[PDB]
Design a protein around this ligand. Structure first.
Ligand SMILES: CCNC(=O)C[C@@H]1N=C(c2ccc(Cl)cc2)c2cc(OC)ccc2-n2c(C)nnc21
Ligand code: NI
Length: 109
C-alpha cells in the first residue's frame, strides 16, 4: 500500500517534470476561470482538479490508496474533455498527458 502510493508519487513527479511540460502545463494549477474569460467553467465543472491539488493531497497524506489518487488525476482529464470541444489543442494535450499517466499507472506494484 505504501509501495503503491510511492508509485503514485513517482507518476505525479513525472507529470510535473520538464520532460512533459509542453503538454502538461495547462494542468499545473487550478483553472483560473475569470483570468481566462471562462465564465461558464464552474457551471459545467462542479469538481475542479489539477496537479498542484493532487500534489497537496499527496504531501498531506490525504490519499489512502492508489485508486483514490488515480480517480483525482483522471477527474482532471475528464474536466478538460467535458468543458472543451474535442478538437481543441488543450484536449490534445490532455490526451497526451493521460497516455503518460495510464501507461505508467498500469505498472502498479
Ligand atoms: C481556446 C481557449 N480555451 C480555454 O481557455 C480553455 C482552457 N485552455 C487552456 C489552453 C491550454 C493550451 C492551449 Cl495551446 C490552449 C488553451 C488552458 C490554459 C491554461 O494555461 C495556464 C490553463 C488551463 C487551460 N485549460 C484547461 C486545463 N482546460 N481548459 C483550459
Ligand atoms: Ni478511476
Amino acid at each position: 500500500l505504501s509501495e503503491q502510493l510511492k508509485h503514485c508519487n513517482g507518476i505525479l513527479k513525472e507529470l510535473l517534470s520538464k520532460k512533459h511540460a509542453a503538454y502538461a502545463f495547462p494542468f499545473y494549477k487550478p483553472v483560473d476561470a475569470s483570468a481566462l474569460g471562462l465564465h461558464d467553467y464552474h457551471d459545467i465543472i462542479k469538481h475542479p482538479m489539477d496537479l498542484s491539488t493532487v500534489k497537496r493531497k499527496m504531501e498531506n497524506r490525504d490519499y489512502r490508496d492508489a485508486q483514490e489518487f488515480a480517480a483525482d488525476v483522471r477527474l482532471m482529464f475528464s474536466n478538460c474533455y467535458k468543458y472543451n470541444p474535442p478538437d481543441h489543442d488543450v484536449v490534445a494535450m490532455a490526451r497526451k498527458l493521460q497516455d503518460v499517466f495510464e501507461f505508467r499507472y498500469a505498472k502498479m506494484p
